[PDB]
Coordinates of C-alpha atoms and ligand atoms in Angstrom, one line a residue:
Chain A
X1 CA 109.4 165.8 31.5
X2 CA 109.3 162.7 29.4
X3 CA 111.9 160.0 28.8
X4 CA 112.1 157.0 26.4
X5 CA 111.3 153.5 27.8
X6 CA 114.1 152.1 25.7
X7 CA 113.5 148.3 25.8
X8 CA 113.1 147.7 29.6
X9 CA 110.0 146.2 31.0
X10 CA 109.8 142.5 30.0
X11 CA 108.8 139.8 32.5
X12 CA 108.2 136.1 32.6
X13 CA 104.5 135.8 31.9
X14 CA 103.6 132.3 33.1
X15 CA 106.0 130.7 35.6
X16 CA 106.7 127.9 33.1
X17 CA 110.2 126.8 32.2
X18 CA 111.2 126.6 28.6
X19 CA 114.7 126.4 27.1
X20 CA 116.3 127.2 23.7
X21 CA 112.9 128.2 22.3
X22 CA 111.1 131.2 20.9
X23 CA 107.7 131.6 22.5
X24 CA 105.1 134.1 21.3
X25 CA 102.8 135.3 24.2
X26 CA 100.2 138.0 24.7
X27 CA 99.8 139.9 28.0
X28 CA 99.9 143.4 29.4
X29 CA 103.5 144.5 28.5
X30 CA 105.1 147.9 28.2
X31 CA 105.4 148.6 24.5
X32 CA 108.9 149.3 23.3
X33 CA 110.1 152.9 23.0
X34 CA 107.0 154.3 24.6
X35 CA 107.0 157.5 26.6
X36 CA 107.6 157.2 30.3
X37 CA 106.7 160.0 32.6
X38 CA 109.5 161.4 34.9
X39 CA 108.4 162.9 38.3
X40 CA 110.3 164.7 41.0
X41 CA 103.9 162.7 45.2
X42 CA 100.7 163.4 43.3
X43 CA 98.0 160.8 42.8
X44 CA 98.3 159.0 39.5
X45 CA 95.9 156.7 37.7
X46 CA 96.6 153.0 37.8
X47 CA 94.5 152.1 34.7
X48 CA 95.6 148.5 33.8
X49 CA 99.1 147.9 35.1
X50 CA 101.9 150.3 35.9
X51 CA 105.6 150.1 35.4
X52 CA 107.7 151.7 38.1
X53 CA 111.4 152.4 38.4
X54 CA 113.6 154.6 40.6
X55 CA 117.3 155.2 41.3
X56 CA 118.6 156.2 44.7
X57 CA 121.2 155.4 47.3
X58 CA 119.5 156.0 50.6
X59 CA 116.1 154.2 50.4
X60 CA 114.4 157.6 50.3
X61 CA 111.2 156.2 48.6
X62 CA 109.6 154.0 51.2
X63 CA 106.0 153.1 50.2
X64 CA 103.0 153.1 48.0
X65 CA 99.2 153.5 48.3
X66 CA 96.6 151.7 46.2
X67 CA 92.9 152.3 46.2
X68 CA 89.8 153.8 44.6
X69 CA 88.6 156.7 46.8
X70 CA 91.2 156.9 49.6
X71 CA 88.5 158.2 52.0
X72 CA 87.9 155.1 54.3
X73 CA 84.8 154.2 52.3
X74 CA 86.6 151.2 50.7
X75 CA 89.5 148.9 51.6
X76 CA 92.8 150.4 50.4
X77 CA 96.2 148.7 50.0
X78 CA 99.1 150.2 51.9
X79 CA 102.8 149.3 51.5
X80 CA 105.3 150.6 54.1
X81 CA 108.8 149.1 53.7
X82 CA 110.5 149.3 57.1
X83 CA 114.2 149.0 57.6
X84 CA 114.1 145.2 57.7
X85 CA 110.4 144.2 57.8
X86 CA 108.3 145.2 54.8
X87 CA 104.6 145.4 55.7
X88 CA 101.6 145.1 53.4
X89 CA 98.1 145.8 54.6
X90 CA 94.6 146.2 53.2
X91 CA 92.5 148.4 55.5
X92 CA 89.8 151.1 55.2
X93 CA 92.5 153.7 55.6
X94 CA 91.9 157.5 55.8
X95 CA 94.7 158.9 53.6
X96 CA 96.3 162.3 54.2
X97 CA 96.4 165.1 51.6
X98 CA 100.1 164.4 51.2
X99 CA 100.9 161.2 53.2
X100 CA 104.6 160.8 54.2
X101 CA 106.7 158.7 56.5
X102 CA 111.1 159.7 59.4
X103 CA 107.8 160.3 61.2
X104 CA 104.7 158.7 59.7
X105 CA 101.2 160.0 59.1
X106 CA 99.4 157.8 56.5
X107 CA 98.7 154.9 58.9
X108 CA 96.2 156.6 61.2
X109 CA 92.6 155.3 61.9
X110 CA 93.4 151.7 60.9
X111 CA 90.0 150.0 61.1
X112 CA 88.3 147.1 59.4
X113 CA 91.5 145.6 58.1
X114 CA 90.8 142.7 55.8
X115 CA 94.3 141.5 54.8
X116 CA 97.7 141.7 56.4
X117 CA 101.0 140.4 54.9
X118 CA 104.6 140.5 56.1
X119 CA 107.7 139.7 54.0
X120 CA 111.4 140.0 53.4
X121 CA 113.0 143.5 52.9
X122 CA 113.0 145.3 49.6
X123 CA 115.2 148.1 48.4
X124 CA 124.1 153.3 41.2
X125 CA 121.2 150.9 41.6
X126 CA 118.0 151.0 39.5
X127 CA 115.0 149.4 41.3
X128 CA 112.1 148.7 39.0
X129 CA 108.7 147.1 39.6
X130 CA 105.6 145.9 37.7
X131 CA 102.1 145.9 39.3
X132 CA 99.2 144.2 37.6
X133 CA 95.7 143.4 39.0
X134 CA 94.2 140.3 37.3
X135 CA 90.9 138.7 38.6
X136 CA 91.5 139.9 42.1
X137 CA 95.2 138.8 42.0
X138 CA 97.6 141.6 42.5
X139 CA 101.0 140.7 40.9
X140 CA 104.3 142.3 41.5
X141 CA 107.4 141.7 39.3
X142 CA 110.6 143.2 40.4
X143 CA 114.4 143.3 39.9
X144 CA 117.1 145.7 41.2
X145 CA 120.0 146.1 38.8
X146 CA 123.4 148.0 38.8
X147 CA 117.4 152.7 31.4
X148 CA 119.4 151.5 28.4
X149 CA 119.6 147.7 28.0
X150 CA 117.5 144.6 28.5
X151 CA 116.6 142.8 31.7
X152 CA 113.9 140.3 32.5
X153 CA 111.6 140.6 35.5
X154 CA 110.9 137.8 38.0
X155 CA 107.7 137.7 40.1
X156 CA 107.8 138.3 43.9
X157 CA 104.3 138.0 45.4
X158 CA 100.7 137.3 44.3
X159 CA 98.2 138.7 46.7
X160 CA 94.5 137.5 46.5
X161 CA 93.1 140.8 47.7
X162 CA 90.3 141.0 45.2
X163 CA 89.9 144.7 45.7
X164 CA 89.0 147.1 42.9
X165 CA 92.1 149.2 42.4
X166 CA 92.0 152.3 40.1
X167 CA 94.5 154.9 41.4
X168 CA 97.7 155.0 43.4
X169 CA 100.1 157.3 45.1
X170 CA 103.8 157.0 46.2
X171 CA 105.2 157.7 49.7
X172 CA 108.5 159.6 50.2
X173 CA 113.7 162.4 44.9
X174 CA 112.7 161.4 41.4
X175 CA 111.0 158.3 39.8
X176 CA 109.7 157.0 36.5
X177 CA 106.1 155.7 35.8
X178 CA 105.0 153.9 32.7
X179 CA 101.8 152.2 31.6
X180 CA 101.2 148.7 30.3
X181 CA 99.2 147.8 27.2
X182 CA 97.9 144.5 25.8
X183 CA 100.6 143.9 23.2
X184 CA 102.1 140.6 22.0
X185 CA 105.8 139.9 22.1
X186 CA 108.1 137.2 20.9
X187 CA 110.2 135.9 23.9
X188 CA 113.6 134.2 23.4
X189 CA 114.5 131.6 26.0
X190 CA 118.1 130.8 26.8
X191 CA 119.2 127.2 27.5
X192 CA 118.9 128.1 31.3
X193 CA 115.3 129.2 30.8
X194 CA 116.0 133.0 31.2
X195 CA 114.6 135.4 28.7
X196 CA 117.5 136.9 26.7
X197 CA 115.8 138.9 23.9
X198 CA 112.3 139.9 22.8
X199 CA 110.5 141.3 19.8
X200 CA 107.6 143.8 19.9
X201 CA 105.4 142.3 17.2
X202 CA 103.7 145.6 16.4
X203 CA 106.6 148.0 16.7
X204 CA 107.6 148.0 13.0
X205 CA 107.1 145.7 10.0
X206 CA 110.4 144.0 10.5
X207 CA 109.3 142.9 13.9
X208 CA 106.0 141.8 12.5
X209 CA 107.9 139.6 10.0
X210 CA 110.2 138.3 12.8
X211 CA 107.1 137.3 14.9
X212 CA 105.4 135.8 11.9
Chain B
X1 CA 90.7 91.8 8.9
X2 CA 87.1 90.5 9.1
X3 CA 87.9 87.3 7.2
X4 CA 88.6 83.6 8.0
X5 CA 91.5 83.5 5.6
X6 CA 94.5 85.8 6.0
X7 CA 96.9 86.4 3.1
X8 CA 100.6 86.4 3.6
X9 CA 101.8 89.8 5.0
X10 CA 102.2 91.9 8.1
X11 CA 99.1 93.4 9.6
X12 CA 98.6 95.9 12.5
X13 CA 96.0 94.6 14.9
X14 CA 96.1 96.5 18.2
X15 CA 98.2 98.7 20.5
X16 CA 100.4 97.9 23.5
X17 CA 100.3 100.3 26.4
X18 CA 101.7 99.9 29.9
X19 CA 99.3 100.8 32.6
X20 CA 100.1 102.9 35.7
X21 CA 100.9 100.9 38.9
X22 CA 100.1 103.5 41.5
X23 CA 99.0 107.1 41.8
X24 CA 101.1 109.8 43.5
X25 CA 99.5 113.0 44.8
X26 CA 101.6 115.9 46.0
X27 CA 100.8 119.4 46.9
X28 CA 102.2 122.5 48.6
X29 CA 103.5 121.8 52.1
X30 CA 101.6 122.6 55.3
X31 CA 101.5 126.3 56.3
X32 CA 99.9 128.6 58.8
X33 CA 97.0 126.9 60.6
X34 CA 93.6 128.6 61.2
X35 CA 93.8 130.1 64.7
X36 CA 91.0 127.8 66.0
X37 CA 93.3 127.9 69.1
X38 CA 91.4 130.8 70.6
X39 CA 87.6 130.7 71.1
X40 CA 86.6 127.5 73.0
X41 CA 90.4 127.4 73.2
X42 CA 89.8 130.7 75.2
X43 CA 89.8 131.8 78.8
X44 CA 86.5 133.7 79.1
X45 CA 83.5 133.8 76.8
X46 CA 81.5 137.0 76.2
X47 CA 77.8 137.0 77.2
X48 CA 75.1 136.3 74.7
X49 CA 73.7 139.9 74.9
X50 CA 77.1 141.0 73.4
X51 CA 78.3 137.9 71.7
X52 CA 81.5 138.1 69.7
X53 CA 81.9 137.7 65.9
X54 CA 85.5 137.0 64.9
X55 CA 86.6 136.8 61.2
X56 CA 89.0 134.1 60.2
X57 CA 90.6 134.2 56.8
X58 CA 93.7 133.2 54.9
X59 CA 94.4 129.9 56.6
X60 CA 93.8 126.2 56.3
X61 CA 90.9 124.9 58.3
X62 CA 91.2 121.3 59.6
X63 CA 87.6 120.4 60.7
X64 CA 88.6 116.8 61.3
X65 CA 90.1 117.5 64.7
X66 CA 87.0 119.3 66.0
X67 CA 84.7 116.8 64.4
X68 CA 86.5 113.8 65.9
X69 CA 86.7 115.6 69.3
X70 CA 84.2 114.2 71.7
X71 CA 84.1 117.4 73.9
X72 CA 81.2 118.8 71.9
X73 CA 77.8 118.2 73.4
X74 CA 76.1 119.1 70.1
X75 CA 77.4 119.3 66.5
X76 CA 74.7 120.1 63.9
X77 CA 75.9 121.0 60.3
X78 CA 73.7 122.1 57.5
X79 CA 74.4 121.5 53.8
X80 CA 77.5 119.3 53.7
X81 CA 78.7 116.4 55.8
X82 CA 81.4 117.4 58.3
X83 CA 83.9 115.0 56.7
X84 CA 83.8 116.7 53.2
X85 CA 84.9 120.1 54.4
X86 CA 88.5 119.1 53.8
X87 CA 87.8 119.3 50.1
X88 CA 85.4 122.3 50.0
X89 CA 86.7 125.9 49.8
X90 CA 85.2 129.1 51.1
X91 CA 86.0 132.8 50.8
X92 CA 85.5 133.8 54.5
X93 CA 84.4 132.2 57.8
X94 CA 82.9 134.0 60.8
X95 CA 82.8 132.6 64.4
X96 CA 79.9 133.7 66.6
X97 CA 80.8 132.9 70.2
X98 CA 78.6 133.3 73.2
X99 CA 77.2 131.5 76.3
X100 CA 73.6 130.3 76.6
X101 CA 71.7 127.7 78.6
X102 CA 70.9 124.2 77.3
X103 CA 67.2 124.9 77.2
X104 CA 68.1 127.8 74.9
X105 CA 70.3 125.7 72.5
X106 CA 67.2 125.0 70.5
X107 CA 67.0 128.6 69.5
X108 CA 70.1 128.4 67.2
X109 CA 68.1 127.3 64.1
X110 CA 66.6 129.0 61.0
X111 CA 63.0 130.3 61.5
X112 CA 62.9 129.8 65.3
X113 CA 61.0 131.8 67.9
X114 CA 61.6 132.7 71.5
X115 CA 63.2 135.3 73.7
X116 CA 66.7 134.6 72.3
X117 CA 65.5 134.3 68.7
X118 CA 63.4 137.5 68.9
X119 CA 65.4 139.9 71.2
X120 CA 68.9 138.4 70.7
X121 CA 71.1 136.5 68.2
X122 CA 68.6 135.4 65.5
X123 CA 69.5 133.1 62.6
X124 CA 68.4 133.8 59.0
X125 CA 65.9 131.6 57.2
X126 CA 68.5 130.9 54.5
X127 CA 71.6 128.6 54.4
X128 CA 73.3 128.2 57.8
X129 CA 76.8 126.8 58.5
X130 CA 77.6 124.6 61.5
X131 CA 76.6 125.1 65.2
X132 CA 78.8 123.7 68.0
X133 CA 77.7 123.5 71.6
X134 CA 78.9 122.0 74.9
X135 CA 78.2 122.2 78.6
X136 CA 80.5 124.6 80.4
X137 CA 79.4 124.1 84.0
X138 CA 82.9 123.5 85.4
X139 CA 84.2 126.9 84.1
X140 CA 81.1 129.2 83.9
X141 CA 79.1 128.0 86.9
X142 CA 75.5 136.4 87.7
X143 CA 78.3 137.6 85.4
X144 CA 76.4 136.3 82.3
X145 CA 73.3 138.1 81.2
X146 CA 70.8 137.7 78.3
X147 CA 69.0 140.5 76.5
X148 CA 65.0 144.1 79.9
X149 CA 68.2 142.2 80.6
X150 CA 68.1 139.2 83.0
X151 CA 70.9 137.2 84.6
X152 CA 71.3 133.4 84.6
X153 CA 71.1 131.6 87.9
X154 CA 74.3 129.6 87.3
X155 CA 74.7 127.5 90.4
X156 CA 77.7 125.0 90.5
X157 CA 75.5 122.1 91.5
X158 CA 70.9 120.0 84.0
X159 CA 69.3 122.5 81.6
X160 CA 70.2 125.5 83.8
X161 CA 74.0 124.9 83.5
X162 CA 75.9 127.3 81.2
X163 CA 76.5 126.2 77.6
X164 CA 79.1 127.9 75.4
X165 CA 78.0 128.1 71.7
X166 CA 80.0 128.8 68.6
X167 CA 78.4 129.2 65.1
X168 CA 80.5 128.7 62.0
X169 CA 79.1 130.9 59.2
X170 CA 80.6 130.4 55.8
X171 CA 81.0 133.0 53.1
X172 CA 81.4 131.1 49.8
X173 CA 81.1 133.7 47.0
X174 CA 82.4 137.0 48.5
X175 CA 85.9 136.7 47.1
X176 CA 88.5 134.3 45.7
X177 CA 88.8 131.3 48.0
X178 CA 91.5 131.5 50.7
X179 CA 90.3 129.2 53.5
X180 CA 90.4 125.5 52.5
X181 CA 91.2 122.2 54.0
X182 CA 94.6 120.5 53.6
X183 CA 95.9 118.3 50.9
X184 CA 97.1 114.9 52.1
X185 CA 100.4 114.1 50.3
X186 CA 101.7 110.7 49.2
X187 CA 105.2 109.3 48.8
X188 CA 106.7 109.6 45.3
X189 CA 107.9 106.6 43.3
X190 CA 110.3 106.9 40.4
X191 CA 111.1 104.9 37.2
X192 CA 107.6 103.5 36.9
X193 CA 104.7 104.5 34.8
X194 CA 102.6 106.3 37.5
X195 CA 99.5 108.5 37.6
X196 CA 100.7 111.7 39.2
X197 CA 99.1 114.9 40.5
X198 CA 101.7 117.7 41.1
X199 CA 100.2 120.9 42.7
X200 CA 97.1 120.7 40.4
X201 CA 98.9 119.4 37.3
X202 CA 97.8 115.9 36.1
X203 CA 99.1 113.3 33.8
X204 CA 100.7 109.9 33.5
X205 CA 104.3 108.8 32.7
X206 CA 107.5 107.8 34.3
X207 CA 109.4 110.2 36.6
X208 CA 113.2 110.3 36.6
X209 CA 115.9 112.6 38.0
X210 CA 116.8 115.4 35.7
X211 CA 119.7 117.8 35.3
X212 CA 117.6 120.8 34.1
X213 CA 118.5 123.9 36.2
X214 CA 115.0 125.4 36.7
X215 CA 114.7 128.9 38.1
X216 CA 113.6 129.2 41.7
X217 CA 110.2 130.6 40.7
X218 CA 109.0 128.4 37.9
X219 CA 107.1 125.3 39.0
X220 CA 106.9 123.1 35.9
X221 CA 108.8 122.9 32.6
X222 CA 107.3 122.4 29.2
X223 CA 109.1 121.4 26.0
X224 CA 108.3 122.5 22.4
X225 CA 104.8 122.0 21.1
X226 CA 103.2 122.6 24.6
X227 CA 104.0 119.3 26.3
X228 CA 105.1 119.0 30.0
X229 CA 108.6 117.7 30.0
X230 CA 109.6 118.3 33.6
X231 CA 108.1 119.4 36.9
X232 CA 109.6 120.4 40.2
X233 CA 108.7 118.4 43.3
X234 CA 107.0 120.0 46.2
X235 CA 108.3 119.0 49.6
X236 CA 111.8 118.3 48.1
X237 CA 112.1 121.1 45.5
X238 CA 113.8 118.4 43.3
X239 CA 113.4 118.7 39.6
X240 CA 112.0 115.5 38.1
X241 CA 111.7 114.6 34.4
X242 CA 108.6 113.1 32.8
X243 CA 108.8 110.6 30.0
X244 CA 105.7 108.9 28.5
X245 CA 105.5 105.3 29.5
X246 CA 106.1 102.9 26.7
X247 CA 103.5 102.2 24.0
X248 CA 103.2 101.2 20.3
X249 CA 101.4 99.2 17.8
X250 CA 101.2 95.5 17.6
Ligands
LIG1 C1 107.8 120.7 53.4 O1 107.8 119.9 54.6 C2 108.7 118.8 54.6 C3 108.5 118.3 56.0 O2 107.3 118.6 56.6 C4 110.1 119.2 54.3 O3 110.9 118.0 54.1 C5 112.1 118.1 54.8 O4 113.2 118.4 54.0 C6 114.5 118.4 54.6 C7 115.5 118.8 53.5 O5 116.1 120.0 53.8 C8 114.8 117.1 55.3 O6 116.0 117.2 56.0 C9 113.7 116.7 56.2 O7 113.9 115.4 56.7 C10 112.3 116.7 55.5 N1 111.2 116.3 56.4 C11 110.5 115.3 56.2 C12 109.4 115.0 57.2 O8 110.7 114.5 55.3 C13 110.2 120.1 53.1 O9 111.5 120.6 52.9 C14 109.2 121.2 53.1 N2 109.2 122.1 51.9 C15 108.9 123.3 51.9 C16 109.0 124.0 50.6 O10 108.5 123.9 52.9
NAG2 C1 108.7 148.1 60.8 O1 107.5 148.8 60.8 C2 106.3 147.9 60.8 C3 105.1 148.7 60.6 O2 105.3 149.8 59.8 C4 106.3 147.1 62.2 O3 105.3 146.2 62.2 C5 107.7 146.4 62.3 O4 107.7 145.8 63.6 C6 108.8 147.4 62.2 N1 110.1 146.6 62.2 C7 111.1 146.9 63.1 C8 110.7 148.1 64.1 O5 112.1 146.3 63.2
NAG3 C1 83.9 146.2 57.4 O1 84.4 145.4 56.3 C2 83.5 144.3 55.9 C3 84.3 143.5 54.8 O2 83.7 143.8 53.5 C4 82.2 144.9 55.4 O3 81.3 143.8 55.1 C5 81.6 145.8 56.5 O4 80.4 146.4 56.0 C6 82.6 146.8 57.0 N1 82.0 147.6 58.1 C7 81.7 147.1 59.3 C8 81.1 148.1 60.2 O5 81.8 145.9 59.5
NAG4 C1 123.6 128.3 31.9 O1 124.1 128.3 33.3 C2 125.3 127.7 33.5 C3 125.6 127.7 35.0 O2 125.1 129.0 35.5 C4 126.4 128.3 32.7 O3 127.6 127.5 32.9 C5 126.0 128.3 31.2 O4 127.0 129.0 30.5 C6 124.7 129.0 31.0 N1 124.3 128.9 29.6 C7 124.3 130.0 28.8 C8 124.8 131.3 29.5 O5 124.0 130.0 27.7

């Protein structure tokens, strides 16, 4: 089952304030009107930056797993959002065939942990996410909103893990998964410095002209 | 004009430029400290036959306190002076903690021989970090053995007294740097042409209060044509405007 990624998925690329200006930038963005896969979890590739989104009312989705082999041979990222204390770890975890957590199973044999991080809690409400791995910096952009329409994405954390991440899996009824691509946009900055509109410069010749 | 006679007119000869009066350096505020609070800071040391190796990462390491501390009997560093570590950065640091005798303190060195260096903790011939040693007679003077295994005759009554030894081994290429010294901050001065350094962003100009509502995540603002027009202050989160300090032709 596929759905259209209407125009969602635009984020501030550089943590730099600008106002009342049109800025053209190149980064891994989700191209406009691309196909987004809809799932109802199996292991999925992570190739170069993955756009996530879910709508629930009871925080049913509770965590992620990131890694390369998921067989304790390498350090693997583990995110387990608790009720009030979200936990991020990087350990040589052994992952279950179908890890799930209200009883948990994925966090057994926690040995040779190389990174631990604790933060503020996350999660009729659509909760999106963006994950990118750049030069050992793992970057998460997020925003929860009350998929048609436009909304910009602010960053949350930047974890200097430096681990080679290739696949992922989600911990648990339905969710969306897109893939980023190295496409250039034109970003419109409001007087308050918030991105209001954008133009996919390779979408169509009119947008090519607008960017030019 | 390269002449001794100047005809009537207006000529441009030089340029006026105000110079900065002082430099202001500011950086992200002090955060979690490296848990140096736990090894010599500790209650009991493991024996040298089963010395401990603790990893320390993702923290700021102030070597000034330990270097100024006079409680260390020996402090031998290789490579860089102990006062420059506040500038240097590393990927990881490991602490090798054990108890030995003073006569055995000579064994902690590259390319050394002896019972310890041959049957026990042996240092590599390559780059070493820093070794710290002190006499621990008061606290540790048959519970301690050395690797076939023999016990020390630690009698509470100079080379046979217990010495506790910690070796600081530095990993400097394994990953992006996460353990570094601090960054001493300075007071900020406004309405003067100053030479500033905000969280790694450099330049000169005059700093004034600004009414630009930045977003909580951006750190510095930049006007059209890629010029820094404002930055936000660390340690006050205030948003301060930058204006080039006056110049022009003469
Ligand atoms: C960084 O640390 C300094 C102090 O170490 C903080 O400055 C304080 O700011 C509050 C304002 O809410 C003042 O009431 C205090 O008097 C300030 N302390 C000093 C010593 O001047 C600053 O807020 C910290 N900033 C961050 C981001 O942690
Ligand atoms: C939530 O779970 C984490 C580990 O999954 C734990 O460290 C934390 O203490 C928990 N918070 C509670 C029980 O409030
Ligand atoms: C544990 O992780 C470290 C970090 O990379 C690695 O060097 C080591 O080989 C791993 N295994 C053991 C037994 O230390
Ligand atoms: C910018 O923000 C201020 C305060 O939030 C608001 O009054 C103003 O209308 C905003 N500018 C816009 C929406 O163009």
